[PDB]
Amino acid sequence: GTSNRDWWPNQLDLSILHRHSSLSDPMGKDFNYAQAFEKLDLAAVKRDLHALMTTSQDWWPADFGHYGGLFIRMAWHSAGTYRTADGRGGAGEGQQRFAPLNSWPANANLDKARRLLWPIKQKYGRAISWADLLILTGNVALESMGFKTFGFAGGRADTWEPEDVYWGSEKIWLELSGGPNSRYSGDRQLENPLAAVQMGLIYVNPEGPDGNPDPVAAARDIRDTFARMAMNDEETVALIAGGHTFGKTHGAGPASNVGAEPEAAGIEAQGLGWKSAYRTGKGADAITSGLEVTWTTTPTQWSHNFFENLFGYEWELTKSPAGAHQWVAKGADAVIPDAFDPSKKHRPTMLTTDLSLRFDPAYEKISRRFHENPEQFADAFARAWFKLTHRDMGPRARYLGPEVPAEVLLWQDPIPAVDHPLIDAADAAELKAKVLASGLTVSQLVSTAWAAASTFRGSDKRGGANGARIRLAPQKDWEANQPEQLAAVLETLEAIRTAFNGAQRGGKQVSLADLIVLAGCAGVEQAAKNAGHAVTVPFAPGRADASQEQTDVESMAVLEPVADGFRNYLKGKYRVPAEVLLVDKAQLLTLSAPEMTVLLGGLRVLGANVGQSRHGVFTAREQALTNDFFVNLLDMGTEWKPTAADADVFEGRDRATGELKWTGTRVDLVFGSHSQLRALAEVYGSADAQEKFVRDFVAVWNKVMNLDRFDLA
Amino acid sequence: GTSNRDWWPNQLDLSILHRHSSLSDPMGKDFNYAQAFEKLDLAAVKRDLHALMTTSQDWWPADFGHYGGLFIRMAWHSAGTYRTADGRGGAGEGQQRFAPLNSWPANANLDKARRLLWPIKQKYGRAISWADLLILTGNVALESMGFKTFGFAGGRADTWEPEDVYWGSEKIWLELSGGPNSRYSGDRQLENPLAAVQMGLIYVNPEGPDGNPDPVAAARDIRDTFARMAMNDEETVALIAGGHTFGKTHGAGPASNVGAEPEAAGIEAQGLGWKSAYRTGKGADAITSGLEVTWTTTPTQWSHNFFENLFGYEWELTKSPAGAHQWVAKGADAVIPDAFDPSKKHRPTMLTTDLSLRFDPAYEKISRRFHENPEQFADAFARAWFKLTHRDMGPRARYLGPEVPAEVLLWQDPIPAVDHPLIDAADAAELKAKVLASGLTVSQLVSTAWAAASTFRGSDKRGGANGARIRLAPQKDWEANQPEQLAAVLETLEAIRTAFNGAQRGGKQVSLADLIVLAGCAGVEQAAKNAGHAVTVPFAPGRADASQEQTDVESMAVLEPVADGFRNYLKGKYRVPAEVLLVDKAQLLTLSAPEMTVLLGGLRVLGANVGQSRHGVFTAREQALTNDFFVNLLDMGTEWKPTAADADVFEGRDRATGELKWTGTRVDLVFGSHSQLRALAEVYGSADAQEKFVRDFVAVWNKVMNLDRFDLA
Ligand code: HEM
Ligand code: HEM
Numbered sequence A, B: 001g002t003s004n005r006d007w008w009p010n011q012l013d014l015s016i017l018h019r020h021s022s023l024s025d026p027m028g029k030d031f032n033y034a035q036a037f038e039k040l041d042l043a044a045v046k047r048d049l050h051a052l053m054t055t056s057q058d059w060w061p062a063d064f065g066h067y068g069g070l071f072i073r074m075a076w077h078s079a080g081t082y083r084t085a086d087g088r089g090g091a092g093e094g095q096q097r098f099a100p101l102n103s104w105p106a107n108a109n110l111d112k113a114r115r116l117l118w119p120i121k122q123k124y125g126r127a128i129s130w131a132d133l134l135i136l137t138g139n140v141a142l143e144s145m146g147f148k149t150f151g152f153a154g155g156r157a158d159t160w161e162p163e164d165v166y167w168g169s170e171k172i173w174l175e176l177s178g179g180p181n182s183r184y185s186g187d188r189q190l191e192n193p194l195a196a197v198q199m200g201l202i203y204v205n206p207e208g209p210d211g212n213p214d215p216v217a218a219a220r221d222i223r224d225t226f227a228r229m230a231m232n233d234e235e236t237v238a239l240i241a242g243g244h245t246f247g248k249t250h251g252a253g254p255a256s257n258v259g260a261e262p263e264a265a266g267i268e269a270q271g272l273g274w275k276s277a278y279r280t281g282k283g284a285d286a287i288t289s290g291l292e293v294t295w296t297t298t299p300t301q302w303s304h305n306f307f308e309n310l311f312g313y314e315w316e317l318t319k320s321p322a323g324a325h326q327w328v329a330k331g332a333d334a335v336i337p338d339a340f341d342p343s344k345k346h347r348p349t350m351l352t353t354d355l356s357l358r359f360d361p362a363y364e365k366i367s368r369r370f371h372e373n374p375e376q377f378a379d380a381f382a383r384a385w386f387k388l389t390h391r392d393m394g395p396r397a398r399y400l401g402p403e404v405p406a407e408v409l410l411w412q413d414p415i416p417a418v419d420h421p422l423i424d425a426a427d428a429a430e431l432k433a434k435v436l437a438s439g440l441t442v443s444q445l446v447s448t449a450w451a452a453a454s455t456f457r458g459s460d461k462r463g464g465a466n467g468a469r470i471r472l473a474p475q476k477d478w479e480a481n482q483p484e485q486l487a488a489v490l491e492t493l494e495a496i497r498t499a500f501n502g503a504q505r506g507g508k509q510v511s512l513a514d515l516i517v518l519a520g521c522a523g524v525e526q527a528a529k530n531a532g533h534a535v536t537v538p539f540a541p542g543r544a545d546a547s548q549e550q551t552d553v554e555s556m557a558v559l560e561p562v563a564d565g566f567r568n569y570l571k572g573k574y575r576v577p578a579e580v581l582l583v584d585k586a587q588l589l590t591l592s593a594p595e596m597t598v599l600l601g602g603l604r605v606l607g608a609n610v611g612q613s614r615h616g617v618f619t620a621r622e623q624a625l626t627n628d629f630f631v632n633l634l635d636m637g638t639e640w641k642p643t644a645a646d647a648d649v650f651e652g653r654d655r656a657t658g659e660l661k662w663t664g665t666r667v668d669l670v671f672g673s674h675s676q677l678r679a680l681a682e683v684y685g686s687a688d689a690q691e692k693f694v695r696d697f698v699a700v701w702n703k704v705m706n707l708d709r710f711d712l713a
């Protein structure tokens, strides 16, 4: 059936902005997962899960009698898709159960793991999401085996369709680097925003880079991909060693015995895949990765045996029964238990990537400290596992249930508690009047608030105006934020805030985070007034101001807008067309196509462009809130041509006279080109639309201002 | 960026069921287009449109000084995509403005026509949809040029994204037959549901079949494709001759001069395409189809000259300036006006397909009658133009405005007006009690009402339970409808209705259409009682009974369910998998994926299957309304295998014992296989879900029962 994407494969795709509609959601429109979960008997769930660990099912028998290792692997894969570059991936939406993740080669036989959990999911129903359950199962695995976890938060609502993520351009699973769609270039530079070395892997290849079994070189890939998942070297060592304390790998026979992944399998498979023709196809005969490694003498108990073995033996290269490269301690004794035959023992074995923790010099320092001080290893692993499994959950205000850790971690971009009374409506009105009387302009006010609020991304729920991190390093110096202009605005606002707060009784005060957003609301209200309309923009107090010491500068770097179509800004020259980057940013802001369209055309006429560029400012009344962007963009009396100097900038000239009327970028002119976006622009460019435009702009503005306000959820 | 459709190109696609969400719609949730239209001053719009006809714009100058031909072509192409097989295409959604229709080769330069209309669209805003405006413009064109139309109805609400329609499998525009994805097989048999001879054409190729200029063979294609658009011979001749009374074709130079279609063009084209390098690119130099024909001596006025010329000359084959086949009148004087140069005249010309009207013997008799009796031609063309442009609008209750024709037409599947008091809630209770006391079972009652209601399709808004057409030819004999069982149900219900109606005062009576639906509601209520739930199903009276004379049997044939997964029914063996046919039917019923899911699982346990099949009846309490379908489908204690006799039937056996528990089809098992459908099934198969399942079932049931109830809109 030939489709529009077949005929016009490079047209812009807006369907990413209308995923997750009420149409695809089985739950009622009023369903609130937080309320369901808060009444779950979490202790009862955990008892069920503990019992499950040692209750083998014949269709996928448990190694050693215990599913703990499989479940820890399942939880780490759930979390292990996360990328800091964009925040996409991670455990927070339970996407392991949908395509394509459910059928990635690295996720083989995790379909069995998910299926073992159906009875428990069924029993508790809507009160526990899959997304929470995958993680909670990994925690119960660890606790059942003697490991003390750092805690657990619920609150990951389930989703109902695949997210649209760029996982790479390769058309072959696992393709080695250097091919026609290579994700590497230069000196082994992985393309942003990817965080895995091959399509279908989680971070790295367990045999070594493109299959070369060199621990030293494997360590370079580990370091790079874990950094792209926001983990430093201490965390990375703790996670790998901690995970490979438990369980085993599966590679009993040749890989050619393994059949179709779940999305390819027959309907009779009922959502499972990788059926194997090797012997019984399961249990002792299981094939998953093709490696056949068991790291420790007690695979079902926490220990410090991973590092005892790693340092205590010398290692030689060998092949598993499937032909993969792996390492064995020859002339160790046969001290490692077999998974199913109590009369068989095995020598210690290791992956290439495990040996990286010893042979990379920076890793070896850390591994040696963890070997000599296994309580330090256990604390680091507990901390890193909580980070791994909660990194995309957003502000601590989202965390639910009785096991939330009290300690506030730097990586959570923490917001101080508010311990004072909040401003009321009359106070908000007084501050809005003060702001407008200071001389700050509509453009200054809207641009500052937009800069503060628009760092939010729904992928990982990081960013937004709460915290007033605009005023701190590094956001105060991001080029998109116009650092000198911003500094002058913030000085003026801080003086207003100091005056107001000095005049109060009773402990009432306004934060700078709330004032930045309230000042942007005053800009919007004044722009509506400039156009002849009286509107009140909604405002919700309660943001707090974070300190510099509460702000990790390096982790904040990935939130820098290097393309922000809403401010007609491109930090440099990218391969991806600017209009594609605009839709990406709209998706991160959680905007639909209509909301993106109204928002952009309003920002243009309010003066939100970086550098006060005239591109897209299709109005003769700048700083008034009107639909002039749309009316002027859609006027057929204007003819548009790319400039000689820059093919991405366009001049709009009167068709009859040739007189120059406007300039625009691709981001501006796509709204007059793309057949769906132009249908939207037409609505807002119609003669009956001025009221609609103002109402819808104010609504979307308020939506952006409140993205991170899970304290009000 | 590699997508799930790249990896798994034959996985079932559910996004068709969640198009048209509130997310992509710019209008607020409560917007009601009928209410907006009803307050439009349609007379003012029509004055503006008459003014536009001779307001030539320099970027696409009007032929003869009058855009009327261009606009009639625009309206006929709007409507001309309709297919009776599925109801998809047509004018009623304004899909011409979106991909792919906006960029079909046969729609070349209609982007100009639509852009001429923007000022009028802009002026009236939301009170006139594009979909209504395209048709209204065509009517005004005709009226401007001297032809009195039959009438016009508004009410076509705009849509905001492309509909998902199968337009063919070819990967080359215009591909001639017999390619790897040929739409023809056999003795020129066009594949259902297609109604065009080549990808990107409307009905037929104006040069002849696959480009061969044989008028007689052309006529076979005309007849077949027009019939697939619901037109008979009289209507087809009236339409073609009527259309080609106006305007001209455009083929002034080689087609190699014409550039990218709109979806391919540069952003600076601002939504237009087919830019031509031939001379001025427009007006006298225009290139659209490549043909250069002007049919009549007065191309801007209604006349009887089409048939005068067709019969009055003999025709010679020639080539246009672009090299397309066309015909010129032998020995004729230069009597046809030029479009731009008053000093030039041209000989009469015709397309191959125009000569079909003379050289096909059935057409010739009609053509000759219209030539001799031009009042008959004029009435036929007015009637056909109204049918062409309204065939997909649905029941007359949807027709809005002051120009609706009063005459009721057979093709409208007319429903008689209700002229008596309707039953009230007390009466509905009394009739549900009578139904349950007759002995009719849950299975009988649900199956009959489902058979009556599920003929509805949202594509053209045909079908549904109003009318009680289930009791007429041909629906009473459709295999899916179980004719002998149905006749016994209808006899029992007709006796109940006769007894009730005989006992009334004051003119009160119940229709059989209402009683069928109310009897199905009673069956649902009884099934809920069987399962221990106290449920009242909503019911809205007001349906009327249509007569046999009001029911065109041939036109009803396209509404026969040859696949209805809701009743586990397939009439024969098709190429398309049965689960794909299910999603198609759910799309016609306007169901989302959750609604499809809940409705199937309920119908299975209520006994709706055709032939009382046990396939998918995953319950030990048939005729009770429970979520058993889902709980038993998802039980991992059951293993599924395809049968030896039939690979599309599956046996479910106890995994431990081997005992046979259930059988099922692909439609049943896809809910356990497809990762998005299985997620939905899980919600309804959870321990907390029985009440949710019942409530959601009753809601979707009532939805289906009410699909055609535009009298209540
Ligand atoms: C360099 C990063 C890593 C590599 C390349 C890697 C590689 C793999 C491979 C190839 C398997 C075998 C799959 C099978 O054949 O069954 C696996 C198993 C496992 N991994 Fe990792 N791993 C990585 C990091 C992690 C981390 C961060 C954790 C968790 C904290 C983890 C926990 C596990 C567990 C528990 C198993 C055993 C599964 C079982 O018993 O069924 N791994 N590892
Ligand atoms: C067998 C069915 C038909 C065929 C193959 C056909 C073919 C075409 C073609 C090839 C053009 C020339 C396009 C261009 O070069 O500008 C055209 C023009 C046009 N057709 Fe048809 N036609 C069909 C039926 C219809 C019908 C049913 C109507 C309307 C009732 C219609 C009304 C028009 C009008 C008014 C024009 C002139 C456009 C102008 O003045 O710009 N045609 N036809």
Ligand SMILES: [Cl-]
Pocket: A088, A089, A090, A095, A163, A164, A165
């Ligand atoms: Cl994601």
Ligand SMILES: [Cl-]
Pocket: B088, B089, B090, B093, B095, B163, B164, B165
């Ligand atoms: Cl359609």
Ligand code: NA
Pocket: A087, A088, A089, A090, A092, A392, A458, A459, A460
């Ligand atoms: Na994410």
Ligand code: NA
Pocket: B087, B088, B089, B090, B092, B392, B458, B459, B460
């Ligand atoms: Na349709």
